[PDB]
Paper text:
ZER1 and ZYG11B, the substrate receptors of the Cullin 2-RING E3 ubiquitin ligase (CRL2), recognize N-terminal (Nt) glycine degrons and participate in the Nt-myristoylation quality control through the Gly/N-degron pathway. Here we show that ZER1 and ZYG11B can also recognize small Nt-residues other than glycine. Furthermore, we present the crystal structures of ZER1 and ZYG11B bound to various small Nt-residues and uncover the molecular mechanism of non-acetylated substrate recognition by ZER1 and ZYG11B. In conclusion, we propose that ZER1/ZYG11B not only targets Gly/N-degrons for proteasomal degradation, but it also has the ability to bind a defined selection of non-Ac/N-degrons by a conserved molecular mechanism of substrate recognition and target their degradation through the non-Ac/N-degron pathway.
To understand the molecular basis of ZER1/ZYG11B-mediated binding of non-Gly Nt-residue peptides, we determined the crystal structures of ZER1 bound to either SFLH-, AFLH- or TFLH-peptide, as well as the crystal structures of ZYG11B bound to either SFLH-, AFLH- or CFLH- peptide. Meanwhile, ZYG11B displayed appreciable binding to Nt-Ser (KD of 6.8), -Ala (KD of 7.1), or -Cys (KD of 3.0), albeit slightly weaker than Nt-Gly (KD of 2.5). Structural comparisons indicated that the peptide-binding modes of ZER1 and ZYG11B are similar. The free α-amino group of the Nt-residue forms hydrogen bonds with the side chains of Asp556 and Asn597 in ZER1 (the counterparts of Asp 526 and Asn 567 in ZYG11B), respectively. Furthermore, the carbonyl oxygen of the Nt-residue is stabilized by two hydrogen bonds from Asn597 and Trp552 in ZER1 (Asp 567 and Trp522 in ZYG11B). The main-chain amide and carbonyl of the second residue (F2) on the peptide hydrogen bond to the main-chain respective carbonyl and amide of Asn679 in ZER1 (Ala647 in ZYG11B). The main-chain amide of the third residue on the peptide is anchored by a hydrogen bond with Asn553 in ZER1 (Asn523 in ZYG11B). Likewise, consistent with the structural observations, the mutants W522A, D526A, N567A, E570A and N523A in ZYG11B were defective in binding to the XFLHVGQD (X = Ser, Ala or Cys) peptides.
Residue numbers in the entry:
A (entry chain A): 479 to 642, 644 to 723
B (entry chain B): 479 to 723
The structure:
Amino acid sequence: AFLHVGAQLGTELFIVRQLLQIVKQKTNQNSVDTTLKFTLSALWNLTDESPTTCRHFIENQGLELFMRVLESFPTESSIQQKVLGLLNNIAEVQELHSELMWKDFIDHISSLLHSVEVEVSYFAAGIIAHLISRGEQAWTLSRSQRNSLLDDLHSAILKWPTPEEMVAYRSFNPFFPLLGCFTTPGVQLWAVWAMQHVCSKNPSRYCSMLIEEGGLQHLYNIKDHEHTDPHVQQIAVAILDSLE
Amino acid sequence: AFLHVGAQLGTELFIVRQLLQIVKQKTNQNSVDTTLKFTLSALWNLTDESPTTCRHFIENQGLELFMRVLESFPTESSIQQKVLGLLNNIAEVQELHSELMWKDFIDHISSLLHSVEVEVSYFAAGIIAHLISRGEQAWTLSRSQRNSLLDDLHSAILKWPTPECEMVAYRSFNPFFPLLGCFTTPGVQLWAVWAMQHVCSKNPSRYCSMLIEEGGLQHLYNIKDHEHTDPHVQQIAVAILDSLE
């Protein structure tokens, strides 16, 4: 039995709010312990593929909280990894785009994009890639930082070493729009790089998911677009032969 | 995205643990408040249709804490309802039957069967019915208490008024089906039929098609024609029936 019809959504939003309260406590106590880490995990997991949870996170000031956990633990890469990963889930949500065009937010993650901890930088790139993908007038912040950041995104991915599981997906669908941003080649480079990674270390799961969800057509579409960035085109042909 | 493949149940259980911590901090503060009531609803729904969460609850000192919650809030009817509804979910899981063979627990439940609030005693009766439905042999506690509790379960169901709103939700009637066959234990069949009639009449659009799809018509018809059956269980059975037939 349960409380009433529909009570499940109410208690998921309640759980989100209590987890955020724990995060706030821990940050206040400067206490990097196992339950803070598990709270960041649980939050990150609940935002997975749930626009509703991501909306709630925002509405309970979670973005300001996570800016503060980033400022209070600048040496804890596992922590920033969970923080930015959840924020990557949020940047995946189109109606939430305006919420992230905060100056201190974008500044902090443009800082973290240049970490050499790929575990950390991958999700900062995710955030920036999704954001820039929304187009020009959608960008309500400094036009010059948009133009800077897309180049830096491209450059920082190129420096990535091949990691030793950074991330897991149930679907590639949030990637496919990125794959078509020829105007902005770092967005694609992040997408194809992410795909190459997850396909390369758990192919049984991920190559299948990719094919079933119609990825081949998109990759291959980059292929015959004769005027694409050569870094992107190279990664995409690697991914294609992986299947083909 | 998420952390690694198949990493969701570690977080579910971490959540049950943290909700229990909230319960014990609110209890020590003697602080009936909206956070505590939300926390008890969250625990209730999480145990819904999942013997793993029930097990993790009992594993993390869940039911001693719920005992103390009952004891610290003797008049709070909504608290008691949420406590007892979780405990009813736990009473449905057969592997976990042994861990509810506890005098203090059974005493708490038998008392709350006589609440003047049917929202409370309904779940007390659910716990009692699932518990005594499992045969005399699985009752590691007293048999005198068992007999007296069947007599009281039956008598109390008949004192119940029609509730105002729907008191509870169910995704499935399957837990009830085994109780309807317990012809030897009329109170258990009585609770099961009363609960079906209640949800069916409060919310027929939801529960009538559900009850017909999961094969309830047959358990009900079996009650209808079985030669020796309790009158009241039979009355409620054919009422449920002719509200379709």
